[PDB]
Design a protein around this ligand. Structure first.
Ligand SMILES: *[C@@H]1O[C@H](CO)[C@@H](O[C@@H]2O[C@H](CO)[C@@H](O[C@@H]3O[C@H](CO)[C@@H](O)[C@H](O)[C@@H]3O)[C@H](O)[C@H]2NC(C)=O)[C@H](O)[C@H]1NC(C)=O
Ligand SMILES: *[C@@H]1O[C@H](CO)[C@@H](O[C@@H]2O[C@H](CO)[C@@H](O[C@@H]3O[C@H](CO)[C@@H](O)[C@H](O)[C@@H]3O)[C@H](O)[C@H]2NC(C)=O)[C@H](O)[C@H]1NC(C)=O
Ligand SMILES: [Cl-]
Ligand SMILES: [Cl-]
Ligand SMILES: [Cl-]
Ligand SMILES: [Cl-]
Ligand SMILES: [Cl-]
Ligand SMILES: [Cl-]
Ligand SMILES: [Cl-]
Ligand SMILES: [Cl-]
Ligand SMILES: [Cl-]
Ligand SMILES: [Cl-]
Ligand SMILES: [Cl-]
Ligand SMILES: [Cl-]
Ligand SMILES: [Cl-]
Ligand SMILES: [Cl-]
Ligand SMILES: [Cl-]
Ligand SMILES: [Cl-]
Lengths: 256, 256
């Protein structure tokens, strides 16, 4: 009375008959598939497997989703019309179709992500935070909304669509939270270290001079000011400056 | 005067001579490699490439690290002994040999991880936290030590050894920070949700009954108590209990 296949597989529909039966046919909601051994429908996927005195069965190959529905087996038995039906159920692997693109905001702003997934049954969609601190799910919905976002809430967020039709599927969104720089380290060959998003752009100063080379070894988070010791103007109070889209800060360093 | 090869490659040592030269030889710190065309050493890796009036060169195949050192070319020129030397330098890809195994402590305890890496030059070793909040490195040393560890400090820590000899190499340690459960959600079919490390073990109660089935749908972080509505003893004050190695907590839930 129920038969379930996955999209693309073949569905075999069976009907039990006996020696009281004089006519038999399969129908797809008034579209004749088979009347006896005669194929009425033009659907090339539909074939006949058996027509004995006990069983009358067909097969729908390469099953689609439109095929889902009731299929009717009509007979003429003892001059009594009789009807037996089967319900073809079609399943589809879950898939994420449209998911919010990568996003970059400033600390304190809001976000709203959407993960649109399809499948049969309609899939369960959940969001998860890719972070060591995370436990369970951030959202058990097709939506994820965060207000007053903080640096610790940045990182990847993973959508996951599931309906037990074979594998569950995922697809990630990267959330970047921007914030002005702050100094991580500063001491005196001579280096300072700053953390920022976007990455810090470093610039050194001495008595407000920019100190152009020939008259620095930089990283996205670290800047070294290197020079030979015990030399001309070997004075302290160098100022490390970390610049960024959202602001700037600094710290002064001595030598001896 | 200097020649550098990677371990396993071949090192070609050259010497420039002229028509004043009457003798010539290559030596490995008093071990004769070649005297003219005569191979004295038994090392099968050492071959002769040229012996013209202008150049005298050999080749050390499948170079090892013990081979590193000075190699001497002796000659007899104008009856004057002359000596020219070359320094073979051997490089080795960086490798992490021993790294602290995975570790699991309680929130507030200490850890100390060590990453022992080898290579030529002796590699630069750094630690990095695999977390969205991380910027730069946790430690620029072969050691990483954390006291009063917190949940947000858990997760993977990556060692990275580098010396620019081809690829840098990494190898991770997983730090798990245990903490007693706390309730994330509780409301009323009827479910509660708790976060813990190790994962929470759930148990429901009603007027101190344990409510054995036949007389619950559980997850490592979530527990559902399911039953038909509008029925016998359809009362509230169900108590969700989250148990763990390190403690336990609970919360009560109503129905209507
Ligand atoms: C059982 O009967 C139903 C209805 O009598 C059959 O359904 C029809 O199947 C076709 C193809 O499988 C569907 O067609 C297409 O239309 C869409 C636009 O809607 C178009 O984008 C496609 O390219 C294609 O042309 C049609 O919509 C669908 N109709 C209904 C009402 O579901 C079904 O195929 C029959 N089963 C078997 C096994 O023959
Ligand atoms: C240039 O001369 C030096 C020294 O005269 C040669 O060094 C020696 O090389 C051998 C093999 O390359 C080394 O041997 C081994 O000993 C270790 C234990 O230390 C053992 O575990 C190994 O299985 C192997 O038996 C030896 O230690 C090393 N000696 C020194 C002082 O470095 C070098 O090979 C010469 N170069 C060429 C190209 O012939
Ligand atoms: Cl997908
Ligand atoms: Cl922005
Ligand atoms: Cl993960
Ligand atoms: Cl992805
Ligand atoms: Cl960030
Ligand atoms: Cl910091
Ligand atoms: Cl950065
Ligand atoms: Cl910037
Ligand atoms: Cl390695
Ligand atoms: Cl423990
Ligand atoms: Cl990473
Ligand atoms: Cl690893
Ligand atoms: Cl943890
Ligand atoms: Cl929480
Ligand atoms: Cl858990
Ligand atoms: Cl436990």
């Amino acid at each position: 009375d129920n038969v379930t296949v996955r999209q693309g597989e073949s569905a075999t529909l069976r009907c039990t008959i006996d020696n009281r039966v004089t006519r038999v046919a399969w129908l797809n909601r008034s579209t004749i598939l088979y009347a006896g051994n005669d194929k009425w429908c033009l659907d090339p996927r539909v074939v006949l497997l058996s027509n004995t005195q006990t069983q009358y069965s067909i097969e729908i190959q390469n099953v689609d989703v439109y095929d889902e529905g009731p299929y009717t087996c009509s007979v003429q038995t003892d001059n009594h019309p009789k009807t037996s039906r089967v319900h073809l159920i079609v399943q589809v692997s879950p898939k994420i179709v449209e998911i919010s693109s990568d996003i970059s905001i400033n600390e304190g702003n809001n976000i709203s992500l959407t993960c649109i997934a399809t499948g049969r049954p309609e899939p369960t969609v959940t969001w998860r935070h890719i972070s060591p601190k995370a436990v369970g799910f951030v959202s058990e919905d097709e939506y994820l909304e965060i207000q007053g976002i903080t640096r610790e809430q940045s990182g990847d967020y993973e959508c996951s669509a599931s309906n037990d039709v074979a594998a569950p599927v995922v697809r990630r969104v990267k959330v970047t939270v921007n914030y002005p720089p702050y100094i991580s380290e500063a001491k005196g060959t001579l280096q300072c270290e700053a953390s920022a998003v976007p990455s810090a752009e470093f610039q050194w100063y001495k008595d407000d001079k920019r100190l152009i080379e020939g008259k620095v070894e930089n990283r996205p988070f670290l800047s070294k000011l290197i020079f030979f010791n015990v030399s001309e103007h070997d004075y302290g109070n160098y100022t490390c400056v970390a610049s960024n889209k959202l602001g700037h800060t600094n710290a002064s360093i001595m030598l001896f």
